[PDB]
Amino acid sequence: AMADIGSMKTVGYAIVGTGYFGAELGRIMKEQEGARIVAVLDPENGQTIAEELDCDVETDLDTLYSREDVEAVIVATPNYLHKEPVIKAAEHGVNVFCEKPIALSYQDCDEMVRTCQEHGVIFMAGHVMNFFHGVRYAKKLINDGVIGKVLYCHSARNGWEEQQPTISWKKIREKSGGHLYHHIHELDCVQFLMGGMPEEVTMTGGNVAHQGEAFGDEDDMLFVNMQFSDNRYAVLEWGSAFHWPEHYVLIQGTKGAIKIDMCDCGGTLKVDGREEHFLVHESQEEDDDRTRIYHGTEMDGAIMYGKPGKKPPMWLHSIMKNEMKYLNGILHGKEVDDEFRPLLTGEAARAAIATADACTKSRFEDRKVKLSEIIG
Amino acid sequence: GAMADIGSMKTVGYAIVGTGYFGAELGRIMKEQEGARIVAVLDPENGQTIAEELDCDVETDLDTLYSREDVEAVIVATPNYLHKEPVIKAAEHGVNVFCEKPIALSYQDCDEMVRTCQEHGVIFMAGHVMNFFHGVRYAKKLINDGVIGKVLYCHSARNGWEEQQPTISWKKIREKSGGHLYHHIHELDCVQFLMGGMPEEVTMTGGNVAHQGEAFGDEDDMLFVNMQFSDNRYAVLEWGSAFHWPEHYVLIQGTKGAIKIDMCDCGGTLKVDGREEHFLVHESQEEDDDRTRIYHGTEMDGAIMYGKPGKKPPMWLHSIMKNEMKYLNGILHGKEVDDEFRPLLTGEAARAAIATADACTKSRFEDRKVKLSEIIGEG
Ligand SMILES: NC(=O)c1ccc[n+]([C@@H]2O[C@H](COP(=O)([O-])OP(=O)(O)OC[C@H]3O[C@@H](n4cnc5c(N)ncnc54)[C@H](O)[C@@H]3O)[C@@H](O)[C@H]2O)c1
Ligand SMILES: NC(=O)c1ccc[n+]([C@@H]2O[C@H](COP(=O)([O-])OP(=O)(O)OC[C@H]3O[C@@H](n4cnc5c(N)ncnc54)[C@H](O)[C@@H]3O)[C@@H](O)[C@H]2O)c1
């Protein structure tokens, strides 16, 4: 509207990593008012996406970020290649949006957050599950006291992956971190719901059914047992060797419970002997579409993993728009909502990777691990 | 049966030690079995009443009871902490033993009970009655038949919401019941049956999160167990009484498919090769649906599901008690023990259940992962 003048500067975005997710974030951000995609860097797919978005290609991160028209960057490289794009952005005074998992070590994540703070640039952690209607609603119910004190969260993200003709980087521990880091969404969600990191974790599991030359080396079953301060608990399950598919977050408090189901897609509140239902995504059509995708891909979860040339489904495209609108607002000086502030302070980024590192160490060293061992 | 069953059957004389909710009903059931007689009961509070109902004698002393010429076997249905002396003294008198779960509240006790019965050459049947559920027998058949391939992972839950009762049952006193883990050991025994024995290593976490008014009972109301089995296999087991999202099931996941035994929304599911099949957990669709009705009635307070003297087990439980008492009576009339039930007679399922429960307990109290070798040694 006419009243927007004063607030509608064009923010120039770079995209580093324009595959499945980076190309689609670029498509979405290009459509946002006051945003332009000026340049992309992606050795394999940059030329193709630059032609689609009508923007430039760069090949060197310092050259890209030295451009006067590059003010912000969306970092959507593979999980193991987030650090250099973020560090060099901060060194050039470029504002950062970074895909999950922020990094595959706490040291990397800590350095990325710290370097952005030292250079006075924004660092937004792309923990997109926080934008789900169902998650926002669960947090509101908790804040409103509807389920009393949260005692216990149980998450699962369990399916069956068939042998593929090729092994994606997403299946290789050194490149993806495996399920715990690639699917860190659930861990971050539980930490948001329970008010931070646990004190101590145990993780068990292994590669039970995907060992050999035709498979990646990631664990295909992971089971986390978290002990929080003040006598509270969480159980988190992941993997790719489960012929009983489950994907949900279950929240149990002194007065009620909340389930966010992403397989039979929908939210349930139990309180005082009644049930209420709520949407996980932004419409019944989005929830029902997600249900159809899970039912259609039951015999092989590998089909849900993005790769260059593929497009995110309806529910994911829709929340990516919400998240890119939120980022664009922050970069046009809209005040950070309390609810999402931990995605900008570094607190959620550090907490997610600290706990993931503690779980990893617990599983590989076969012992309980205190978060203090990771964070100091 | 068969043509060979013609002729009078030898009567086996049964004692019952503990005739509360469960012992009184086991007596009613065994009395109806051919070739079985209930001859005497010992129960300080309820023995006179149950003996009048079953038309049998009352004893007050275990050695006197077992020295009776007519006592050949005993059903031990005392509270969880009072199983050892009735079993040991039965064995010392050459009396065959059926013992309620949990066999005992320590591995030392359980092991001594098994060893003493072996020393005296008497039968010792572990009353792990969940092995007599139609849906558990069917799940085992599917697994043995290779339908779901190698079992990789079992997940059990037995989670509800219990209100504090005006007066506290022995079942809520940890030294008397052993708390959820031992009083509801059914799920732990079920997982170990399906995964072929004890795990190598366990972790248990939990606490009294919502029953601070009952802290004197020293029981956790939430328990979470993480089991690591040999050859890269796992289990997760949940229990407790502070869960406003009720769940009671055993989920079995293998290389080729999965089986769920649901005891809340009562029914079995097989998932394999892109299809689902339904099967019964109990003896009929009516028994499953009755169990579902019971769980809907107890959702706001699971405390009402606990038996106490004067109460009768529900239909599904009466049915498996009949299955189990018929099995026991057959063994005591010289029927050969099936491979399926043999671990209930060898001591192996009894020792495995209590060994793992003790390891879980130690893990929770010491706040660390515990190897089963700490309990059982290096073999
Ligand atoms: N919902 C979500 O938040 C969501 C979903 C999918 C993926 N992701 C995240 O998005 C990121 C990318 O995953 P994806 O699904 O797009 O993977 P993808 O394999 O589809 O794309 C990765 C792209 O990175 C490019 N690339 C590789 N090395 C590079 C380098 N050095 N510099 C620049 N580009 C490089 C590749 O050429 C490719 O185009 C990861 O962090 C992943 O975890 C997030
Ligand atoms: N397998 C199952 O499905 C199932 C279900 C319920 C109970 N049980 C088991 O049955 C046993 C008894 O539980 P319950 O539900 O009947 O409890 P209950 O409280 O109803 O009955 C316990 C009985 O033990 C008697 N008793 C107490 N001390 C005794 C002693 N020293 N000698 C003899 N009798 C004594 C009491 O008088 C009472 O009659 C326990 O092992 C319990 O775990 C098993």
Author numbering:
A (entry chain BBB): 2 to 377
B (entry chain AAA): 1 to 379
The authors write:
RgNanOx (RUMGNA_02695) from R. gnavus ATCC 29149 catalyzes the equilibration of 2,7-anhydro-Neu5Ac and Neu5Ac. The novel oxidoreductase identified in our work showed to catalyze the conversion 2,7-anhydro-Neu5Ac to Neu5Ac in the presence of NAD+ in a reversible manner. The protein shows a Rossman fold typical of NAD-binding protein of the Gfo/Idh/MocA class characterized by a central β-sheet with helices on either side. Here, we showed that RgNanOx acts through a multistep mechanism involving a keto intermediate and cycling of NADH/NAD+.
In the RgNanOx structure, there is additional density adjacent to the nicotinamide ring that, given the high resolution of the second structure, we were able to unambiguously identify as citric acid from the crystallization buffer. Using the high-resolution structure, we used a simple modeling approach to place a molecule of DANA a transition state analog inhibitor of sialidases, in RgNanOx active site by overlapping the carboxylate acid of the DANA with each of the three carboxylate groups of citric acid. Next we manually positioned the sugar such that the H3 of the atom ring pointed toward the C4′ of the nicotinamide, as would be required for hydride transfer. These models were then minimized, and we investigated whether the H4 atom of DANA was still able to transfer to nicotinamide. Only one position where the DANA carboxylate was placed on the 2-carboxylic acid of citric remained positioned for hydride transfer. The model indicated that His-178, predicted to be a catalytic residue, is positioned to remove the proton from O4 during the oxidation step. His-176 is plausibly positioned to undertake proton transfer with the O7 of the substrate glycerol that the mechanism requires. His-175 interacts with the negatively charged carboxylic acid in the model but could play a role in proton transfer at the substrate C3 atom. Lys-93 binds to NAD+, is part of the catalytic constellation, and is also within a plausible distance for proton transfer to C3. Lys-163 binds to the NAD+ co-factor and interacts with the substrate carboxylate.
